[PDB]
Amino acid sequence: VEEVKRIMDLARQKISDAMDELNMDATLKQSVDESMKRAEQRAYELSKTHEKTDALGQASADLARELVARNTSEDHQKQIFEALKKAAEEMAHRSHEDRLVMALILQTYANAKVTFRILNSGKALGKEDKMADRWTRLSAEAASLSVQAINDSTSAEKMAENFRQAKEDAVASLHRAGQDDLARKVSEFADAGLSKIDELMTLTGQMWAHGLFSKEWEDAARSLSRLAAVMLAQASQTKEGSLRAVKAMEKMADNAADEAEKLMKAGSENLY
């Protein structure tokens, strides 16, 4: 419970540093300082009742759904995304403190990018009436998985066991849902070391948007998240691998948001 506070304080000070370096709006800055004060207090509140990884995941999820806020201009939200991306980029320049923290901003940045596009798509399309709230809980599960994957980075057999488990699970899940081709591409991606992490993160994001909008793709999206989280835990052990992880997480966030927009403007009209 005590190690969570150091993670939240360090990551928070890094987004504060990125905010000051970027010449941001003073009101926008201190509003976000209070917004992650909320995540600081919530990190301590949810522990000892929920597990530590679950508390960190919901802290990041509420932090991102917070970072969208209520009435914020598009440039300010883009600037929040820029501050998170730059803070992760500079967190790639370093301890076990750095790797777990950098994943936490990346999970929050990925969560915040997709939530903002879900909410903004309804305003243009006239469908402001709801899917973003579930995505917060789904990414709360996802953020704890990525935290746990980097929590496993101290070992070397837990790494191989988790990697083989997640590769088998992702291939089996896509086979089980009738996607034989995609299952074989996921096997190839998992077979190519870290050289195919960009395409795997693109596919992971697109399936995150599809498992959000339809429950029949949920297990495939979760299994792809497990495989991707293991891979990113392998990447962040080094310096440029942390940088490649930052770029790959950006890839996942952008593709998940693009597929979320495409799915919102396609016939999501049910029937009474």
Residue numbers in the entry: 4 to 97, 100 to 134, 138 to 280
From the paper:
Here we introduce Chroma, a generative model for proteins and protein complexes that can directly sample novel protein structures and sequences, and that can be conditioned to steer the generative process towards desired properties and functions. Given backbones from this diffusion process, the Chroma design network then generates sequence and side-chain conformations that are conditioned on the sampled backbone to yield a joint generative model for the sequences and structure of a protein complex. We sought to characterize the space of possible proteins parameterized by Chroma by generating a large number of unconditional samples of proteins and protein complexes (100,000 single-chain proteins and 20,000 complexes across two versions of the models, v.0 and v.1). The experimental characterization of 310 proteins shows that sampling from Chroma results in proteins that are highly expressed, fold and have favourable biophysical properties.
We reasoned that the best way to determine the plausibility of the protein space parameterized by Chroma was to draw independent samples from the model and test them experimentally. Our experimental validation shows that Chroma has learnt a sufficiently accurate distribution such that sampling from it results in proteins that express, fold, have favourable biophysical properties and conform to intended structures at non-trivial rates. The crystal structures of two designed proteins exhibit atomistic agreement with Chroma samples (a backbone root-mean-square deviation of around 1.0 Å). Moreover, the two designs with experimentally determined crystal structures demonstrate that a non-trivial fraction of this distribution should be expected to be atomistically accurate.
